[PDB]
Amino acid sequence: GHMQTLIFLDLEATGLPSSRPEVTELCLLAVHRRALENTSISQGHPPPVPRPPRVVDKLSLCIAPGKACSPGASEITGLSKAELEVQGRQRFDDNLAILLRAFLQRQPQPCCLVAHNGDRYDFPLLQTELARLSTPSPLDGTFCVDSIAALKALEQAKSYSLGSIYTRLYWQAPTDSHTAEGDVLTLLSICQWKPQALLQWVDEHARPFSTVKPMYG
Amino acid sequence: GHMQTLIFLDLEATGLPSSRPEVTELCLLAVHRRALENTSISQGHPPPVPRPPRVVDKLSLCIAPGKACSPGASEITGLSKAELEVQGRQRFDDNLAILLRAFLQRQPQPCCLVAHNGDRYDFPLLQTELARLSTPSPLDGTFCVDSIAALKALEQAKSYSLGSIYTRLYWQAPTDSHTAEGDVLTLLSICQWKPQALLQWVDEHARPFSTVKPMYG
Ligand SMILES: Cc1cn([C@H]2C[C@H](O)[C@@H](COP(=O)(O)O)O2)c(=O)[nH]c1=O
Ligand SMILES: Cc1cn([C@H]2C[C@H](O)[C@@H](COP(=O)(O)O)O2)c(=O)[nH]c1=O
């Protein structure tokens, strides 16, 4: 093995890729590889939803966008530009990059970001947001992985939405859907199903986050 | 109506004040004044446990102490120096101060830290840990308040442990006791009981954190 830290990540945003979206919420959940392994091999039909590991670093932040959320985006996320602004939320700026860098620096390296549909949404969007900044990217030196690819490779060894996978494994609806922390915790639970095989796959397929093409711009 | 952000805070540590303890876990939950103001005033006996605000900044970090946790502290917190270290946790250091600074910077000012038994434990300890650092304290300019004194004023208008207050108000046991984030979320729930009245008291009684004497030298 080699990845020492897995950082489960989700974003909420103003809309879909075609609308050229801006991030409205992000959550990072850093778990050491040993904490993942030390979840039991899921047993029972269905297995109970596992508790997160005790030792965990968490960062969840709301972010004011420069453009308004779409009707459908505000509906599912429960966030709006006006509500983010009135509650004094700041934009995706240099101070946020320092925050992210300092958080990431507290983790043993190498680090791998894990996001559901990360390759098509979360990673390219995050790359676009960071490229606007004047500070060096805080995610330089870090690696990344799409959990959908992970689950597909583990499963094969129809819907692949986060909710559908979770309900298939646990026979329960996920909670706090379409919130950054809620979806991160849901993703964690899914990745605790076969953590030893997951980490093995992650070490095999982790790519530099610097190779991720920006969504736009 | 001056405090713009309330930051609910809890620490886990290696032991009791007399042992000269070190921080092992910290959680900050930043909530804008408006999110507390617009929480439903609790009605019924007992009232339901209040819903957390949608818009929230959360920071939860595990910290490797220099000295071991007491057996009793390990039992209640679920944390040990040994486990914190094997999982690559870093000390309370300069990088952590930078991380805290950047988190606080994202919050509209003036800010007020809210901690249960904060005056005797959390605030002096955090002051001691920050005093060890070469870089200036990021909490200079932030205010602080003890929620025990708050609830003593609100209730009176014998136990004041976090758990006792929660069960008295909601006729429910608190979840995830003696974990930084667990205790922060419990503290939030208690503070959402009479949130307008809590905010008014905080406005009148909040003191600069820079006036907090360190627990030990
Ligand atoms: C699933 C979905 C997401 N989105 C946008 C808004 C969300 O903040 C963002 C991230 O998706 P998520 O909520 O699955 O994490 O994508 C839509 O606009 N419509 C949709 O149906
Ligand atoms: C309540 C309690 C706390 N402590 C120490 C360990 C905890 O990490 C620290 C913070 O208290 P807390 O768990 O109530 O937040 O105080 C004890 O040593 N013994 C005790 O009985």
Side-chain angles (χ1 to χ4, degrees):
Chain A
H2 259 83
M3 294 298 144
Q4 297 305 302
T5 304
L6 294 194
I7 302 183
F8 300 92
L9 171 287
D10 188 42
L11 305 175
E12 301 303 327
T14 50
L16 297 168
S18 75
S19 74
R20 328 224 309 170
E22 293 183 38
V23 177
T24 56
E25 200 183 25
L26 68 73
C27 178
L28 279 69
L29 192 56
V31 182
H32 192 272
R33 70 177 293 109
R34 197 76 174 275
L36 263 146
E37 289 158 11
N38 283 201
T39 302
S40 299
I41 314 159
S42 288
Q43 208 153 320
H45 304 296
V49 179
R51 186 170 161 175
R54 179 66 186 87
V55 182
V56 149
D57 284 1
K58 191 193 285 179
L59 177 71
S60 190
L61 302 160
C62 290
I63 302 155
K67 68 205 292 175
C69 299
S70 72
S74 283
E75 220 163 51
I76 60 154
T77 65
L79 300 168
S80 64
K81 186 178 171 284
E83 196 62 66
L84 292 156
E85 287 175 336
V86 84
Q87 296 193 64
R89 296 308 92 190
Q90 294 179 11
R91 308 267 195 87
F92 207 112
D93 54 10
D94 289 328
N95 178 70
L96 178 50
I98 288 153
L99 209 177
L100 291 165
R101 176 58 159 85
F103 181 89
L104 298 166
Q105 196 180 311
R106 281 197 62 82
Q107 315 309 320
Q109 308 285 316
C111 289
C112 191
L113 298 171
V114 185
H116 181 84
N117 201 219
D119 285 347
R120 301 218 302 164
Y121 198 87
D122 284 342
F123 304 146
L125 220 202
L126 193 45
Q127 193 80 289
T128 290
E129 289 284 24
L130 293 171
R132 288 194 186 108
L133 313 176
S134 49
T135 55
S137 177
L139 285 174
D140 258 278
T142 69
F143 299 80
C144 73
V145 126
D146 197 322
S147 61
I148 295 180
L151 273 309
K152 280 182 182 176
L154 297 181
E155 185 190 333
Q156 298 167 57
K158 280 289 160 196
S159 183
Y160 281 99
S161 81
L162 188 74
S164 200
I165 299 164
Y166 185 92
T167 65
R168 274 202 305 272
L169 299 179
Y170 297 113
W171 296 19
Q172 295 172 45
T175 66
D176 306 310
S177 289
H178 308 290
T179 73
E181 187 176 332
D183 292 355
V184 159
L185 290 170
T186 297
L187 180 62
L188 206 210
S189 300
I190 290 164
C191 294
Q192 281 175 287
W193 165 61
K194 283 269 185 68
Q196 69 288 146
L198 194 265
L199 282 156
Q200 190 186 209
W201 185 90
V202 165
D203 294 336
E204 290 163 8
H205 297 91
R207 59 159 175 160
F209 188 85
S210 58
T211 65
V212 175
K213 296 187 183 194
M215 188 179 279
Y216 61 92
Chain B
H2 33 282
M3 296 298 148
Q4 292 296 290
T5 302
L6 290 204
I7 297 194
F8 299 95
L9 175 279
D10 183 46
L11 313 172
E12 301 307 323
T14 53
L16 295 171
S18 66
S19 75
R20 289 170 66 97
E22 289 182 57
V23 175
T24 59
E25 208 188 11
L26 69 74
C27 179
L28 280 64
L29 191 68
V31 181
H32 192 274
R33 153 180 295 268
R34 295 186 181 281
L36 281 169
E37 283 176 336
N38 290 286
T39 305
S40 298
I41 287 170
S42 286
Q43 270 187 283
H45 300 283
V49 178
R51 198 179 192 174
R54 176 62 186 93
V55 175
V56 132
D57 281 4
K58 190 186 283 181
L59 176 66
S60 192
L61 297 167
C62 289
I63 300 154
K67 67 214 285 172
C69 301
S70 68
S74 280
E75 190 176 352
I76 65 156
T77 64
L79 297 168
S80 73
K81 173 166 181 273
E83 197 54 50
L84 291 161
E85 294 212 352
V86 70
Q87 293 193 47
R89 294 312 91 186
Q90 295 178 7
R91 303 283 188 104
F92 205 114
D93 57 4
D94 282 342
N95 180 65
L96 180 49
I98 297 166
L99 199 169
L100 287 165
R101 184 177 285 271
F103 184 85
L104 295 159
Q105 188 76 33
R106 283 195 65 83
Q107 314 311 320
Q109 308 293 305
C111 278
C112 189
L113 307 178
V114 186
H116 196 80
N117 203 215
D119 281 357
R120 274 160 35 86
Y121 198 88
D122 289 346
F123 303 144
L125 218 203
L126 198 51
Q127 195 76 284
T128 291
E129 291 277 31
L130 292 165
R132 283 188 171 109
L133 309 182
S134 55
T135 55
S137 166
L139 282 172
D140 185 32
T142 77
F143 296 82
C144 74
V145 95
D146 194 328
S147 54
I148 296 185
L151 270 293
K152 275 186 181 174
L154 296 176
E155 187 183 336
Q156 301 161 41
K158 299 277 155 56
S159 183
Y160 280 92
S161 70
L162 187 78
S164 292
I165 298 164
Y166 187 87
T167 80
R168 271 207 311 276
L169 295 180
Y170 304 117
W171 294 22
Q172 284 196 24
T175 79
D176 303 324
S177 297
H178 311 290
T179 74
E181 187 178 325
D183 294 346
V184 157
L185 293 178
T186 298
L187 171 61
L188 209 215
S189 295
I190 295 151
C191 289
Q192 277 178 291
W193 172 56
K194 297 196 297 182
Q196 284 104 314
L198 185 267
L199 272 168
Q200 193 180 153
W201 187 91
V202 165
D203 281 348
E204 294 165 338
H205 299 91
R207 75 195 178 109
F209 185 83
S210 58
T211 70
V212 174
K213 293 179 190 184
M215 184 183 280
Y216 60 89

